[PDB]
Amino acid sequence: MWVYRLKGTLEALDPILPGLFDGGARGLWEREGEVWAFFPAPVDLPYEGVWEEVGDEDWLEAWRRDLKPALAPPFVVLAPWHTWEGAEIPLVIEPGMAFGTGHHETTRLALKALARHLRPGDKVLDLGTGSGVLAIAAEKLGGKALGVDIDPMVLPQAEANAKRNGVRPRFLEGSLEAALPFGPFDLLVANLYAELHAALAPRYREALVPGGRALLTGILKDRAPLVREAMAGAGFRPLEEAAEGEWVLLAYGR
């Protein structure tokens, strides 16, 4: 579809609005000193506005502007342009393509679990760091973190996010093995999925010091047994369960 931009407020343009509608306008929005009128394709109008086709880009900018802070006590996840009067801990994440915006339930379960199981001074491994939000949160709690991901594309955004938050976790491409050289760790947090955790259970144990913690999420309610089963079999002890919707987080001690 096309947009027809016009300078002025709705109040101001009220006089020609009926005309826009007669011209076939199906949508209308006031966007920062401007009024956008949406049509299927351009039509001839006397208002001296400017036509422009709408695309995926515009559809994000619009979404971006409708974004609101997300709570995850004791944290609040904010867009780089968000304001927060509250007391919760600020986590600035550029709404991007890398997972970790703070809008998914799993991310939220992870943040809350981290605050409970992480202590000032702990070494942390954020397996599948994505946006790097969990690693960033670990540094905010007073921990030293390493975020890894098999997807290279996310690391610059993670690094950029860390920067916005004024903390500097270590980020690197790879999985659990790429990380071992930096271990063992006091805590490991991983937002993946039930089946993969199941296969990794054994390595999770080797990644942690005795008494270390493993926070697993990305788990659907109906796939938790796989994890309970794999973890126990891996010598871990159950410590906490949490869910939001169909998603759950399982915390284990080693």
Ligand X SMILES: C[S@@+](CC[C@H](N)C(=O)[O-])C[C@H]1O[C@@H](n2cnc3c(N)ncnc32)[C@H](O)[C@@H]1O
Pick out the residues of the known binding site for S-adenosyl-L-methionine.
Answer: 107, 128, 149, 175, 191
Q: What sign for the dihedral angle of Cα 71, 74, 79, 84? A: positive
Phi/psi class of residue 121: alpha, beta or left (left: φ > 0; alpha: ψ in -120 to 50)? left
Tell me which residues in 63-122 interact with ligand X (CB under 6 A).
Answer: 99-100, 104, 107, 110
Chain breaks in the chain (C to N over 2.5 A) after: none
Place of tokens 């209308």: 28
In 3-state terms the chain splits into helix, strand, coil percentages (rounded to 5) of 35, 30, 35
Tell me which residue has its CB nearest to ligand X: 128
State yes or no: residue 234 binds ligand X (CB under 6 A): no
In the complex with ligand X, which residue's Cβ is closer, 99 or 236?
Answer: 99
| Measured CA distances, 197 to 36, 203, 239 (Å) | 48, 10, 16
State yes or no: residue 157 binds ligand X (CB under 6 A): no
Alpha-carbon span 69 to 77, nearest angstrom: 6
Binder of ligand X out of 25, 76, 91, 134 (CB under 6 A): 134
Residues in binding contact with ligand X, number by CB under 6 A: 20
State yes or no: residue 198 binds ligand X (CB under 6 A): no
Binder of ligand X out of 37, 91, 154, 219 (CB under 6 A): 154
Residues found near ligand X in the complex (CB under 6 A): 99-100, 104, 107, 110, 127-131, 133-134, 149-151, 154, 175, 191-192, 218
